[PDB]
Amino acid sequence: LIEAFRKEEARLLHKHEYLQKRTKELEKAKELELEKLNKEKSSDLTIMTLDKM
Amino acid sequence: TDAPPVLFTVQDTARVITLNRPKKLNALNAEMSESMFKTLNEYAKSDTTNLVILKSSNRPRSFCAGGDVATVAIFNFNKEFAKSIKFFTDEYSLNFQIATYLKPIVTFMDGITMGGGVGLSIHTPFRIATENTKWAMPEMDIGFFPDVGSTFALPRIVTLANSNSQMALYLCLTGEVVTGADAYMLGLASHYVSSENLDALQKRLGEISPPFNNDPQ
């Protein structure tokens, strides 16, 4: 029973840390992915634009 | 926010390139040349573009009064020689792209076509002139040379008194201005079309497409 209570607490704390690390990674990956999407390519020259208007 | 120097638009299967520097008579700077050079490479790869049409939004006032050499002069006075060499690498590279372009390019020389403007049309087999066309190469008065491959085109396209490049030397060394029908008869213009008919011609160019299994090249 002592091993059960200490393993459960460790698991809970280890799970919070893993989620925090995973979320930060996902957030960083999303920023990188979005940055690639916003990167201008040569094909974009063939897309008609009316930026001024 | 500012009006783009060169405007690109779709005309059915034709892609219209319009010079948009009316206050400067459509003078060609490094920005304009670079934009046109990059966009033409994309159109060459595309399989939906059959031809390109190089015109101006200032017609009949001017098509292109020439490369922007006044800015290149300031660079020389400021020793910004890197900037000057960029302006000529872009312009001359665009003139080389037009000359070797595999798809038909149709230039509407509806207005003053002097200097860089000549480079935009002299290298296209379809260079249409109008009553408002004013072709000249006024470089001898500014201290420069006949650029934009005019020393390779004029000696090979002029029709009269050009057996030994005599007429080509006359236009490049005297800076004589040729107007409308005279440009067509000398070989400076491939076709002579009234300005009023340019709108209709543009629409017809966008509507024609290679038949069956023939590419636009």
Side-chain angles (χ1 to χ4, degrees):
Chain A
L1 190 51
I2 293 167
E3 183 177 2
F5 288 150
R6 298 201 176 286
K7 281 182 164 178
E8 189 68 357
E9 187 174 32
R11 153 183 163 282
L12 294 163
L13 298 176
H14 179 286
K15 175 194 171 188
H16 176 253
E17 302 163 2
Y18 163 80
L19 288 186
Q20 293 300 320
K21 293 176 185 178
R22 194 201 65 179
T23 52
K24 288 182 182 183
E25 292 173 11
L26 296 174
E27 300 152 19
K28 293 180 180 179
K30 287 164 188 178
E31 295 314 309
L32 295 178
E33 293 163 26
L34 175 55
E35 190 165 12
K36 165 55 195 263
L37 297 173
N38 302 349
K39 177 199 70 178
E40 173 164 2
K41 303 203 303 172
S42 69
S43 56
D44 291 344
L45 293 173
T46 67
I47 305 177
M48 297 310 91
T49 55
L50 302 161
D51 297 318
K52 179 164 179 298
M53 172 191 67
Chain B
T1 312
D2 185 3
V6 173
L7 300 168
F8 308 94
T9 56
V10 168
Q11 174 61 64
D12 184 2
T13 62
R15 299 295 172 279
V16 181
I17 307 183
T18 307
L19 309 180
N20 189 59
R21 287 191 70 186
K23 293 180 295 184
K24 304 296 186 179
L25 291 191
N26 302 318
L28 289 180
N29 58 5
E31 176 177 2
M32 289 179 78
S33 299
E34 186 169 2
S35 181
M36 283 177 294
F37 181 71
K38 293 171 172 176
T39 310
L40 278 177
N41 286 325
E42 312 310 322
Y43 290 156
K45 303 168 192 153
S46 167
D47 300 0
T48 45
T49 299
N50 287 314
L51 62 88
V52 175
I53 298 176
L54 177 56
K55 58 185 287 194
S56 59
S57 54
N58 187 26
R59 81 186 193 88
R61 173 165 155 243
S62 65
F63 163 65
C64 177
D68 204 10
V69 304
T71 64
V72 169
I74 301 304
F75 297 173
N76 301 358
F77 296 126
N78 306 353
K79 277 36 180 171
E80 305 167 0
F81 302 117
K83 289 190 183 177
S84 297
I85 295 167
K86 183 185 166 59
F87 166 98
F88 289 115
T89 300
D90 292 359
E91 170 175 21
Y92 297 173
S93 294
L94 181 69
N95 290 323
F96 185 60
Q97 186 189 29
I98 290 166
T100 60
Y101 211 75
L102 305 191
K103 290 183 193 171
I105 298 185
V106 181
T107 307
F108 294 171
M109 298 178 320
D110 199 306
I112 299 159
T113 303
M114 293 177 191
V118 175
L120 289 184
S121 53
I122 207 77
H123 295 288
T124 60
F126 303 115
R127 48 202 185 291
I128 308 180
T130 74
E131 65 276 348
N132 314 305
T133 293
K134 299 170 190 61
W135 182 104
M137 282 310 243
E139 295 82 33
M140 300 303 97
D141 280 342
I142 301 296
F144 208 60
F145 73 102
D147 65 309
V148 302
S150 61
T151 52
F152 173 100
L154 296 198
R156 291 183 173 79
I157 73 165
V158 172
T159 61
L160 295 182
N162 192 67
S163 303
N164 192 7
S165 309
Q166 302 105 330
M167 185 69 198
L169 285 164
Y170 169 65
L171 297 173
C172 292
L173 298 175
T174 311
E176 181 58 19
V177 177
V178 190
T179 58
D182 302 306
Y184 170 65
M185 285 294 288
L186 282 175
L188 304 174
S190 61
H191 293 80
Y192 186 69
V193 171
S194 66
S195 63
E196 302 96 328
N197 276 336
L198 288 191
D199 181 5
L201 176 62
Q202 181 174 325
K203 293 200 207 180
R204 171 69 175 177
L205 288 174
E207 296 167 58
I208 57 174
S209 302
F212 316 132
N213 188 63
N214 304 304
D215 65 356
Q217 299 181 358

PDB file of all heavy atoms in Angstrom, chain B residues 35-56:
ATOM      1  N   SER B  35      10.367  42.531 -60.593  1.00  0.00           N
ATOM      2  CA  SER B  35       9.017  41.981 -60.521  1.00  0.00           C
ATOM      3  C   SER B  35       8.629  41.306 -61.831  1.00  0.00           C
ATOM      4  O   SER B  35       8.148  40.167 -61.838  1.00  0.00           O
ATOM      5  CB  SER B  35       8.020  43.087 -60.172  1.00  0.00           C
ATOM      6  OG  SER B  35       6.702  42.574 -60.071  1.00  0.00           O
ATOM      7  N   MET B  36       8.832  41.998 -62.954  1.00  0.00           N
ATOM      8  CA  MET B  36       8.466  41.426 -64.246  1.00  0.00           C
ATOM      9  C   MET B  36       9.300  40.191 -64.554  1.00  0.00           C
ATOM     10  O   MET B  36       8.786  39.202 -65.088  1.00  0.00           O
ATOM     11  CB  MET B  36       8.634  42.470 -65.347  1.00  0.00           C
ATOM     12  CG  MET B  36       7.524  43.506 -65.391  1.00  0.00           C
ATOM     13  SD  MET B  36       7.797  44.779 -66.639  1.00  0.00           S
ATOM     14  CE  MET B  36       9.241  45.605 -65.978  1.00  0.00           C
ATOM     15  N   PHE B  37      10.593  40.227 -64.227  1.00  0.00           N
ATOM     16  CA  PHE B  37      11.454  39.085 -64.511  1.00  0.00           C
ATOM     17  C   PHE B  37      11.007  37.853 -63.739  1.00  0.00           C
ATOM     18  O   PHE B  37      10.995  36.741 -64.280  1.00  0.00           O
ATOM     19  CB  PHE B  37      12.906  39.422 -64.175  1.00  0.00           C
ATOM     20  CG  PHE B  37      13.865  38.304 -64.465  1.00  0.00           C
ATOM     21  CD1 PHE B  37      14.177  37.966 -65.770  1.00  0.00           C
ATOM     22  CD2 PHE B  37      14.443  37.585 -63.434  1.00  0.00           C
ATOM     23  CE1 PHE B  37      15.054  36.934 -66.041  1.00  0.00           C
ATOM     24  CE2 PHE B  37      15.321  36.553 -63.700  1.00  0.00           C
ATOM     25  CZ  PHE B  37      15.627  36.227 -65.004  1.00  0.00           C
ATOM     26  N   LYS B  38      10.635  38.028 -62.469  1.00  0.00           N
ATOM     27  CA  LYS B  38      10.216  36.887 -61.663  1.00  0.00           C
ATOM     28  C   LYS B  38       8.861  36.359 -62.113  1.00  0.00           C
ATOM     29  O   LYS B  38       8.665  35.143 -62.211  1.00  0.00           O
ATOM     30  CB  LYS B  38      10.168  37.278 -60.189  1.00  0.00           C
ATOM     31  CG  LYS B  38      11.522  37.578 -59.585  1.00  0.00           C
ATOM     32  CD  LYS B  38      11.384  38.169 -58.196  1.00  0.00           C
ATOM     33  CE  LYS B  38      12.731  38.279 -57.511  1.00  0.00           C
ATOM     34  NZ  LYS B  38      12.625  38.946 -56.185  1.00  0.00           N
ATOM     35  N   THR B  39       7.916  37.257 -62.396  1.00  0.00           N
ATOM     36  CA  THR B  39       6.577  36.820 -62.774  1.00  0.00           C
ATOM     37  C   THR B  39       6.573  36.136 -64.135  1.00  0.00           C
ATOM     38  O   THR B  39       5.732  35.267 -64.386  1.00  0.00           O
ATOM     39  CB  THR B  39       5.620  38.012 -62.786  1.00  0.00           C
ATOM     40  OG1 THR B  39       5.737  38.735 -61.556  1.00  0.00           O
ATOM     41  CG2 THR B  39       4.181  37.545 -62.956  1.00  0.00           C
ATOM     42  N   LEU B  40       7.501  36.506 -65.021  1.00  0.00           N
ATOM     43  CA  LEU B  40       7.554  35.870 -66.331  1.00  0.00           C
ATOM     44  C   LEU B  40       8.079  34.445 -66.240  1.00  0.00           C
ATOM     45  O   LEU B  40       7.650  33.578 -67.009  1.00  0.00           O
ATOM     46  CB  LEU B  40       8.422  36.695 -67.281  1.00  0.00           C
ATOM     47  CG  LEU B  40       7.754  37.892 -67.964  1.00  0.00           C
ATOM     48  CD1 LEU B  40       8.768  38.650 -68.804  1.00  0.00           C
ATOM     49  CD2 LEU B  40       6.580  37.446 -68.822  1.00  0.00           C
ATOM     50  N   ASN B  41       9.000  34.180 -65.311  1.00  0.00           N
ATOM     51  CA  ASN B  41       9.464  32.812 -65.111  1.00  0.00           C
ATOM     52  C   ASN B  41       8.326  31.914 -64.647  1.00  0.00           C
ATOM     53  O   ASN B  41       8.213  30.763 -65.087  1.00  0.00           O
ATOM     54  CB  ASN B  41      10.616  32.790 -64.105  1.00  0.00           C
ATOM     55  CG  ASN B  41      11.915  33.309 -64.694  1.00  0.00           C
ATOM     56  OD1 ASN B  41      12.201  33.099 -65.872  1.00  0.00           O
ATOM     57  ND2 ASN B  41      12.706  33.992 -63.876  1.00  0.00           N
ATOM     58  N   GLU B  42       7.470  32.419 -63.756  1.00  0.00           N
ATOM     59  CA  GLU B  42       6.321  31.637 -63.310  1.00  0.00           C
ATOM     60  C   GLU B  42       5.369  31.358 -64.468  1.00  0.00           C
ATOM     61  O   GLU B  42       4.896  30.228 -64.635  1.00  0.00           O
ATOM     62  CB  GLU B  42       5.596  32.366 -62.179  1.00  0.00           C
ATOM     63  CG  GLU B  42       6.512  32.867 -61.074  1.00  0.00           C
ATOM     64  CD  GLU B  42       7.453  31.794 -60.565  1.00  0.00           C
ATOM     65  OE1 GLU B  42       7.029  30.624 -60.467  1.00  0.00           O
ATOM     66  OE2 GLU B  42       8.621  32.122 -60.268  1.00  0.00           O
ATOM     67  N   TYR B  43       5.076  32.376 -65.281  1.00  0.00           N
ATOM     68  CA  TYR B  43       4.174  32.173 -66.409  1.00  0.00           C
ATOM     69  C   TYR B  43       4.746  31.175 -67.405  1.00  0.00           C
ATOM     70  O   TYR B  43       3.989  30.460 -68.072  1.00  0.00           O
ATOM     71  CB  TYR B  43       3.888  33.504 -67.106  1.00  0.00           C
ATOM     72  CG  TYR B  43       3.035  34.475 -66.312  1.00  0.00           C
ATOM     73  CD1 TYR B  43       3.092  35.841 -66.564  1.00  0.00           C
ATOM     74  CD2 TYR B  43       2.167  34.031 -65.323  1.00  0.00           C
ATOM     75  CE1 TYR B  43       2.315  36.733 -65.850  1.00  0.00           C
ATOM     76  CE2 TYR B  43       1.387  34.917 -64.604  1.00  0.00           C
ATOM     77  CZ  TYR B  43       1.465  36.266 -64.872  1.00  0.00           C
ATOM     78  OH  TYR B  43       0.692  37.152 -64.160  1.00  0.00           O
ATOM     79  N   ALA B  44       6.074  31.112 -67.526  1.00  0.00           N
ATOM     80  CA  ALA B  44       6.685  30.139 -68.425  1.00  0.00           C
ATOM     81  C   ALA B  44       6.448  28.712 -67.948  1.00  0.00           C
ATOM     82  O   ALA B  44       6.281  27.806 -68.771  1.00  0.00           O
ATOM     83  CB  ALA B  44       8.183  30.414 -68.552  1.00  0.00           C
ATOM     84  N   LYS B  45       6.430  28.495 -66.633  1.00  0.00           N
ATOM     85  CA  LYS B  45       6.177  27.164 -66.095  1.00  0.00           C
ATOM     86  C   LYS B  45       4.698  26.800 -66.152  1.00  0.00           C
ATOM     87  O   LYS B  45       4.359  25.614 -66.233  1.00  0.00           O
ATOM     88  CB  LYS B  45       6.664  27.082 -64.648  1.00  0.00           C
ATOM     89  CG  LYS B  45       8.135  27.414 -64.459  1.00  0.00           C
ATOM     90  CD  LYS B  45       8.470  27.587 -62.986  1.00  0.00           C
ATOM     91  CE  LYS B  45       9.844  28.208 -62.789  1.00  0.00           C
ATOM     92  NZ  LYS B  45       9.934  28.962 -61.507  1.00  0.00           N
ATOM     93  N   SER B  46       3.818  27.795 -66.113  1.00  0.00           N
ATOM     94  CA  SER B  46       2.385  27.539 -66.075  1.00  0.00           C
ATOM     95  C   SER B  46       1.906  26.903 -67.374  1.00  0.00           C
ATOM     96  O   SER B  46       2.432  27.182 -68.455  1.00  0.00           O
ATOM     97  CB  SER B  46       1.626  28.843 -65.825  1.00  0.00           C
ATOM     98  OG  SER B  46       0.240  28.689 -66.081  1.00  0.00           O
ATOM     99  N   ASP B  47       0.901  26.037 -67.256  1.00  0.00           N
ATOM    100  CA  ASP B  47       0.275  25.393 -68.402  1.00  0.00           C
ATOM    101  C   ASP B  47      -1.096  25.979 -68.712  1.00  0.00           C
ATOM    102  O   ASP B  47      -1.800  25.459 -69.585  1.00  0.00           O
ATOM    103  CB  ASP B  47       0.160  23.885 -68.164  1.00  0.00           C
ATOM    104  CG  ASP B  47       1.508  23.224 -67.955  1.00  0.00           C
ATOM    105  OD1 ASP B  47       2.534  23.935 -67.988  1.00  0.00           O
ATOM    106  OD2 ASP B  47       1.542  21.991 -67.756  1.00  0.00           O
ATOM    107  N   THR B  48      -1.495  27.047 -68.017  1.00  0.00           N
ATOM    108  CA  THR B  48      -2.755  27.727 -68.277  1.00  0.00           C
ATOM    109  C   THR B  48      -2.572  29.073 -68.962  1.00  0.00           C
ATOM    110  O   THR B  48      -3.566  29.671 -69.387  1.00  0.00           O
ATOM    111  CB  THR B  48      -3.535  27.942 -66.969  1.00  0.00           C
ATOM    112  OG1 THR B  48      -2.653  28.432 -65.953  1.00  0.00           O
ATOM    113  CG2 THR B  48      -4.171  26.642 -66.501  1.00  0.00           C
ATOM    114  N   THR B  49      -1.340  29.561 -69.084  1.00  0.00           N
ATOM    115  CA  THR B  49      -1.051  30.826 -69.746  1.00  0.00           C
ATOM    116  C   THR B  49      -0.529  30.536 -71.146  1.00  0.00           C
ATOM    117  O   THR B  49       0.473  29.831 -71.306  1.00  0.00           O
ATOM    118  CB  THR B  49      -0.028  31.644 -68.959  1.00  0.00           C
ATOM    119  OG1 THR B  49      -0.550  31.948 -67.659  1.00  0.00           O
ATOM    120  CG2 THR B  49       0.295  32.941 -69.692  1.00  0.00           C
ATOM    121  N   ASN B  50      -1.211  31.076 -72.154  1.00  0.00           N
ATOM    122  CA  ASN B  50      -0.835  30.871 -73.546  1.00  0.00           C
ATOM    123  C   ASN B  50       0.045  31.987 -74.088  1.00  0.00           C
ATOM    124  O   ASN B  50       0.966  31.720 -74.866  1.00  0.00           O
ATOM    125  CB  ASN B  50      -2.088  30.748 -74.417  1.00  0.00           C
ATOM    126  CG  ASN B  50      -2.806  29.426 -74.226  1.00  0.00           C
ATOM    127  OD1 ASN B  50      -2.183  28.365 -74.214  1.00  0.00           O
ATOM    128  ND2 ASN B  50      -4.125  29.483 -74.084  1.00  0.00           N
ATOM    129  N   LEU B  51      -0.211  33.231 -73.693  1.00  0.00           N
ATOM    130  CA  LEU B  51       0.575  34.363 -74.160  1.00  0.00           C
ATOM    131  C   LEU B  51       0.566  35.441 -73.087  1.00  0.00           C
ATOM    132  O   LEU B  51      -0.236  35.411 -72.151  1.00  0.00           O
ATOM    133  CB  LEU B  51       0.039  34.901 -75.493  1.00  0.00           C
ATOM    134  CG  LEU B  51      -1.385  35.464 -75.512  1.00  0.00           C
ATOM    135  CD1 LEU B  51      -1.413  36.949 -75.164  1.00  0.00           C
ATOM    136  CD2 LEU B  51      -2.023  35.223 -76.869  1.00  0.00           C
ATOM    137  N   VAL B  52       1.477  36.398 -73.234  1.00  0.00           N
ATOM    138  CA  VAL B  52       1.591  37.525 -72.318  1.00  0.00           C
ATOM    139  C   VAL B  52       1.454  38.808 -73.123  1.00  0.00           C
ATOM    140  O   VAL B  52       1.828  38.868 -74.298  1.00  0.00           O
ATOM    141  CB  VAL B  52       2.927  37.496 -71.542  1.00  0.00           C
ATOM    142  CG1 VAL B  52       3.084  38.741 -70.676  1.00  0.00           C
ATOM    143  CG2 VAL B  52       3.018  36.238 -70.695  1.00  0.00           C
ATOM    144  N   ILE B  53       0.907  39.839 -72.484  1.00  0.00           N
ATOM    145  CA  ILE B  53       0.679  41.132 -73.118  1.00  0.00           C
ATOM    146  C   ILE B  53       1.312  42.195 -72.233  1.00  0.00           C
ATOM    147  O   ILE B  53       0.871  42.408 -71.097  1.00  0.00           O
ATOM    148  CB  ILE B  53      -0.813  41.417 -73.336  1.00  0.00           C
ATOM    149  CG1 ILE B  53      -1.411  40.363 -74.272  1.00  0.00           C
ATOM    150  CG2 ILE B  53      -1.012  42.818 -73.909  1.00  0.00           C
ATOM    151  CD1 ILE B  53      -2.900  40.497 -74.488  1.00  0.00           C
ATOM    152  N   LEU B  54       2.345  42.856 -72.748  1.00  0.00           N
ATOM    153  CA  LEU B  54       3.045  43.917 -72.035  1.00  0.00           C
ATOM    154  C   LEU B  54       2.522  45.256 -72.540  1.00  0.00           C
ATOM    155  O   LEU B  54       2.756  45.628 -73.693  1.00  0.00           O
ATOM    156  CB  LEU B  54       4.553  43.799 -72.243  1.00  0.00           C
ATOM    157  CG  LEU B  54       5.419  44.882 -71.603  1.00  0.00           C
ATOM    158  CD1 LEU B  54       5.161  44.985 -70.106  1.00  0.00           C
ATOM    159  CD2 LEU B  54       6.880  44.582 -71.880  1.00  0.00           C
ATOM    160  N   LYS B  55       1.810  45.976 -71.677  1.00  0.00           N
ATOM    161  CA  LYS B  55       1.215  47.259 -72.019  1.00  0.00           C
ATOM    162  C   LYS B  55       1.495  48.253 -70.900  1.00  0.00           C
ATOM    163  O   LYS B  55       2.195  47.955 -69.930  1.00  0.00           O
ATOM    164  CB  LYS B  55      -0.294  47.126 -72.254  1.00  0.00           C
ATOM    165  CG  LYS B  55      -1.045  46.567 -71.060  1.00  0.00           C
ATOM    166  CD  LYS B  55      -2.512  46.347 -71.371  1.00  0.00           C
ATOM    167  CE  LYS B  55      -3.263  47.661 -71.462  1.00  0.00           C
ATOM    168  NZ  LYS B  55      -4.734  47.446 -71.441  1.00  0.00           N
ATOM    169  N   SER B  56       0.949  49.456 -71.055  1.00  0.00           N
ATOM    170  CA  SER B  56       1.024  50.500 -70.048  1.00  0.00           C
ATOM    171  C   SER B  56      -0.382  50.948 -69.667  1.00  0.00           C
ATOM    172  O   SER B  56      -1.335  50.796 -70.434  1.00  0.00           O
ATOM    173  CB  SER B  56       1.839  51.698 -70.549  1.00  0.00           C
ATOM    174  OG  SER B  56       1.274  52.245 -71.728  1.00  0.00           O
TER     175      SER B  56
END
